[PDB]
Design an enzyme around this catalytic site. Sequence first.
Site, PDB file in Angstrom:
ATOM      1  N   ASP A   1       0.846  -1.190   0.000  1.00  0.00           N
ATOM      2  CA  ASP A   1       0.000   0.000   0.000  1.00  0.00           C
ATOM      3  C   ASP A   1       0.883   1.242   0.000  1.00  0.00           C
ATOM      4  OD1 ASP A   1      -1.915   2.071   0.731  1.00  0.00           O
ATOM      5  OD2 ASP A   1      -3.141   0.489   1.619  1.00  0.00           O
ATOM      6  N   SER A   2       0.398   2.327  -0.595  1.00  0.00           N
ATOM      7  CA  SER A   2       1.178   3.557  -0.596  1.00  0.00           C
ATOM      8  C   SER A   2       1.101   4.136   0.814  1.00  0.00           C
ATOM      9  CB  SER A   2       0.598   4.567  -1.585  1.00  0.00           C
ATOM     10  OG  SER A   2      -0.736   4.885  -1.234  1.00  0.00           O
TER      11      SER A   2
ATOM     12  N   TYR B   1      -0.064   8.088  -3.962  1.00  0.00           N
ATOM     13  CA  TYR B   1       0.338   7.749  -5.324  1.00  0.00           C
ATOM     14  C   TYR B   1      -0.580   8.393  -6.363  1.00  0.00           C
ATOM     15  CZ  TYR B   1       3.550   3.889  -3.932  1.00  0.00           C
ATOM     16  OH  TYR B   1       4.575   3.102  -3.448  1.00  0.00           O
TER      17      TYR B   1
ATOM     18  N   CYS C   1      -4.120  -0.729  -2.280  1.00  0.00           N
ATOM     19  CA  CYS C   1      -4.602   0.625  -2.547  1.00  0.00           C
ATOM     20  C   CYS C   1      -5.152   0.778  -3.961  1.00  0.00           C
ATOM     21  CB  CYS C   1      -3.508   1.661  -2.267  1.00  0.00           C
ATOM     22  SG  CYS C   1      -2.006   1.488  -3.226  1.00  0.00           S
ATOM     23  N   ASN C   2      -6.103   1.694  -4.116  1.00  0.00           N
ATOM     24  CA  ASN C   2      -6.768   1.925  -5.393  1.00  0.00           C
ATOM     25  C   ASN C   2      -5.901   2.346  -6.572  1.00  0.00           C
ATOM     26  OD1 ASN C   2      -9.978   3.151  -4.028  1.00  0.00           O
ATOM     27  ND2 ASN C   2      -8.890   1.193  -3.862  1.00  0.00           N
ATOM     28  N   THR C   3      -4.996   3.299  -6.368  1.00  0.00           N
ATOM     29  CA  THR C   3      -4.162   3.758  -7.471  1.00  0.00           C
ATOM     30  C   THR C   3      -3.260   2.656  -8.021  1.00  0.00           C
ATOM     31  OG1 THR C   3      -4.193   6.040  -6.657  1.00  0.00           O
ATOM     32  CG2 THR C   3      -2.461   5.471  -8.227  1.00  0.00           C
TER      33      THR C   3
ATOM     34  N   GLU D   1      -7.150   8.648   9.913  1.00  0.00           N
ATOM     35  CA  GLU D   1      -5.706   8.638  10.160  1.00  0.00           C
ATOM     36  C   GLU D   1      -5.328   9.370  11.442  1.00  0.00           C
ATOM     37  OE1 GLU D   1      -3.578  10.080   6.690  1.00  0.00           O
ATOM     38  OE2 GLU D   1      -3.723   8.094   5.769  1.00  0.00           O
TER      39      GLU D   1
ATOM     40  N   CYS E   1     -12.847   3.108  -0.138  1.00  0.00           N
ATOM     41  CA  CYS E   1     -11.584   3.597   0.400  1.00  0.00           C
ATOM     42  C   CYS E   1     -11.281   2.694   1.591  1.00  0.00           C
ATOM     43  CB  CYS E   1     -11.703   5.047   0.865  1.00  0.00           C
ATOM     44  SG  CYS E   1     -10.202   5.658   1.681  1.00  0.00           S
TER      45      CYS E   1
ATOM     46  N   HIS F   1      -9.758   3.162   4.173  1.00  0.00           N
ATOM     47  CA  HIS F   1      -9.798   3.832   5.471  1.00  0.00           C
ATOM     48  C   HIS F   1     -11.202   3.782   6.076  1.00  0.00           C
ATOM     49  CE1 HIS F   1      -6.026   5.724   4.174  1.00  0.00           C
ATOM     50  NE2 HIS F   1      -5.884   6.240   5.382  1.00  0.00           N
TER      51      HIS F   1
END
Lengths: 271, 271
Positions: free
Chosen positions: A14-15, A46, A77-79, A156, A188, A190
């Site tokens: 993950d970024s 990213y 992660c999505n990107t 976060e 997402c 998160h």
Amino acid sequence: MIRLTDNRPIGFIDSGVGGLTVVKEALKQLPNENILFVGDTARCPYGPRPAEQVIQYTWEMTDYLVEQGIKMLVIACNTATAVALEEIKAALSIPVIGVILPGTRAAVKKTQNKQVGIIGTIGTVKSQAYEKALKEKVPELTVTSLACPKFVSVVESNEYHSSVAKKIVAETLAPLTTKKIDTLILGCTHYPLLRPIIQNVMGENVQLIDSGAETVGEVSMLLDYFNLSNSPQNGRTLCQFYTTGSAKLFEEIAEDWLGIGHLNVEHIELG
Amino acid sequence: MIRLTDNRPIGFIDSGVGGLTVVKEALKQLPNENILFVGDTARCPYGPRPAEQVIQYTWEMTDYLVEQGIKMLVIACNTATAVALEEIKAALSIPVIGVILPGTRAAVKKTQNKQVGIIGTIGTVKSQAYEKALKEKVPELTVTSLACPKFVSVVESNEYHSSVAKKIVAETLAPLTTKKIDTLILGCTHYPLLRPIIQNVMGENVQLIDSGAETVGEVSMLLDYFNLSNSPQNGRTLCQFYTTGSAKLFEEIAEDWLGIGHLNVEHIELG
């Protein structure tokens, strides 16, 4: 008819730290699997970066875990999933799975009135990744995509249970409550931390889809398909996290989100 | 990030007609996928045969469908899955899935008190295929395996709704009702036709696991993983059945079990 015992870990990259919710689901759904996770927090996010950089960085995390011995890779992660997954999956011999299709598949299966919603970062929403994946499966679906700009910061900052969180979620999702949506994708990683608040706002009649949880569901099947399962006699013996940024901050966030006590977090260097 | 439209059919092979319930689930869960099915009724059953013959016959059905253009293969019967699946899966380039692990995986996920049961033919029960698969995943499970000798004849004779069926199921499953079992695997593809009766006998507190239905669930995920899905714009345009035995009898059984009108059944020759 030979079942192999493979205690090699499953890797997650993950970024940032969002992917920790995918790990949280892996710990619960796959109690006997070892885990390795890398969070490239030194270069997060990213999204705004050119595809060339995203691919390079994702490859660096991948190479690091492959060298650490992983038998399967989850791009959390999505990107990275949208930009680098296909190239990495085609080059590696180990299975590679992303966090968009599994959630999409689950949403299509659960909706009854075909009114589906998806919430996530503005980057994810504007990319139309989910809308496109959903309609490629069921074109008659009416999809509503809504960016939730401040959700990530709230999570976060470990304030996902505060009054600030309840207000931000309530106000952000307001327009989404008048679309007769019966299925909402948490687009997402998160967001699972805000699930209770999101559920309350949307109502008991709305089924929430945890994309990361569905990804882990696929991993479970893939372990069987590829004959890569660890044995219950071994159980999980390894769970190590690596970060290119602050190990201290990463540990604070990870231990809070996972709620299972002390976690092993090591600062590393990539590229 | 390229999604491919592949209208090639998914193939299903079986020594007999039981696999038709797996096809029934595919028609429902995968509405846009084309289907090819071969039933080697001229040589059914495979169970009592030496592994060498089972492998040879399963390969003949496989080769036939591969030549007909399938993009994925489902081995729908227990003997072929236990005896020939690994060899075929290792030799072919297309995905190959069986009907034991998917059901096992689902049972492990649904049980709460760890009291799991499995019913099927004496051949399946004596082979311990399910018991072993279940315990390899969760050794603490208390597994009760029960052969149901006459269920197949009742179903193949299209008498699965009769009083004869209700008596045979009630008397056969009696001893299974006093084990506190909360999850029961239908370990024979013929059994879904008796589901209502089986459910009534076992009670509302017992979750039934349709192994074939779970196999189709895995297929759905594999279509995404391997980028082999057909498009909804194409939809299902082909559903053809082949049998080495009586096409007339096969058609009568298939049309009755599927309940969707006329079906295309062709008599073929193998080996």
